[PDB]
Write a protein that binds this ligand. Structure first.
Ligand SMILES: O=C(/C=C/c1ccccc1Cl)NO
Ligand SMILES: [K+]
Ligand SMILES: [K+]
Ligand SMILES: [Zn+2]
Length: 399
């Protein structure tokens, strides 16, 4: 059974931010326009019995003062007096500024993604769904007491924390163009949550982490979590096939050696060739899309899986991609062919898909070898440190 997180309130809140506007509404309407909803189990966002229970849930990761600050930021943007100097300084100490501005619904908006991904985790734990999709979640940059990259609350960390706390191991796979620093940082000392992020990194590129550190080396966890944080930084321009070749053997080896109880996939869409970032050249093509390749491989493991959204700034193209990921998930889990018309069906947001209105995004197309050796060695070190039973010939064979 494949779940998907949505709801009427949930939709309004996910579409209330200045940065991502109505992206979520395009995504869910396209999924709906392709008639996939009847195939999917609706998963309602989690709600709480009281303010105290909500605070308890969220401060599982975030500090109480940060949460307080985030709530006050909302109240302040709901009045039209300027913030006092004192309020500005409080907000600054939490990076609630610049690229993480306040807006009238900023706490409700951020909390929604958390409600969504907590319900997704619970649906997996109680075995109601084999896979749950939350395209309203995926905010991997938020820290304990710090907003970052328009992430205010880290819904992924909270979902993952709920999963491990239910010999439980979680594999977190971050496909976003950006390094999943928040999630990685959160589980830096935890061997039972292995994080793996593939991303672009270059000097000055957000957020700066997930690459060689200041010959220099890769940090990879600490304490009992040593060797438990995996990173593959790629240079710009990479396409579907090279991207797929770069991460394929790593995903497979991670699964084999770690044997996770849950997989949590962040599927931020800013790797698309047509994203305004224009760094990687991935597509949503399904004849092959790096995304669809990675998700299919992960789903072939038959491990209960959380699939989340994230970045993606070309809203129709993000919708095009996540519609195909959603179709792919249904087909792989329920074992039934999903046929999708090559052109966008008429629906409320049909016009946004110009000019050609088809489902493919409008695009025509040794360093990695060093990384594989480096990571296999980290995986071996991880396995050794944690006394796991790995077959070194089979893992090595994958490369
Ligand atoms: O999409 C992202 C980050 C986007 C970003 C980066 C730097 C500054 C602001 C933003 Cl929204 N990562 O998930
Ligand atoms: K990533
Ligand atoms: K870890
Ligand atoms: Zn991103």
């Amino acid at each position: 059974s494949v779940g998907i997180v949505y709801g009427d309130q949930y939709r309004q809140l996910c579409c209330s931010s200045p940065k991502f506007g109505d992206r979520y509404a395009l995504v869910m309407d396209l999924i709906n326009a392709y008639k996939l909803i009847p195939e999917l189990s609706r998963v309602p966002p989690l709600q709480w019995d009281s303010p105290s229970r909500m605070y308890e849930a969220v401060t599982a990761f975030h500090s109480t003062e940060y949460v307080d600050a985030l709530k006050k930021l909302q109240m302040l943007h709901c009045e039209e007096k300027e913030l006092t100097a004192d309020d500005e300084l409080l907000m600054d100490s939490f990076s609630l500024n610049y690229d993480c501005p306040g807006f009238p619904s900023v706490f409700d908006y951020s909390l929604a993604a958390v409600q969504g991904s907590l319900a997704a985790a619970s649906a997996l734990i109680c075995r109601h769904c084999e896979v749950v999709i939350n395209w309203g979640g995926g905010w991997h940059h938020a820290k304990r007491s710090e907003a970052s990259g328009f992430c205010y609350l880290n819904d992924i960390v909270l979902a993952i924390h709920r999963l491990v706390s239910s010999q439980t191991r979680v594999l977190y796979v971050d496909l976003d163009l950006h390094h999943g620093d928040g999630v990685e940082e959160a589980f830096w000392y935890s061997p039972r949550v292995v994080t793996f992020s593939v991303h672009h990194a270059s000097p000055g590129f957000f957020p700066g982490t997930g690459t060689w550190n200041m010959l220099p080396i890769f940090l990879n966890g600490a304490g009992r979590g040593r060797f438990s944080a995996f990173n593959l930084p790629l240079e710009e321009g990479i396409n579907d096939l090279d991207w797929s070749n770069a991460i394929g053997p790593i995903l497979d080896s991670l699964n084999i050696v770690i044997q996770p109880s849950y997989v949590v996939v962040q599927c931020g869409a800013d790797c698309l060739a047509t994203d305004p970032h224009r760094i990687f050249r991935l597509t949503n093509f399904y004849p092959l899309s790096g995304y669809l390749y990675a998700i299919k491989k992960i789903l072939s493991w038959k491990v209960p899986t959380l699939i989340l959204g994230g970045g993606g700034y070309n809203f129709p193209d993000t919708a095009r991609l996540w519609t195909r990921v959603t179709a792919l998930t249904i087909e792989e889990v329920k074992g039934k062919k999903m046929t999708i018309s090559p052109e966008i069906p008429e629906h409320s947001y049909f016009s946004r898909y110009g000019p050609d209105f088809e489902l493919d995004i409008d695009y025509f197309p040794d360093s990695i070898q060093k990384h594989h050796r480096r990571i296999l060695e980290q995986l071996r070190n991880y396995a050794d440190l944690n006394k796991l039973i790995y077959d070194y010939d089979q893992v090595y064979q994958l490369y």
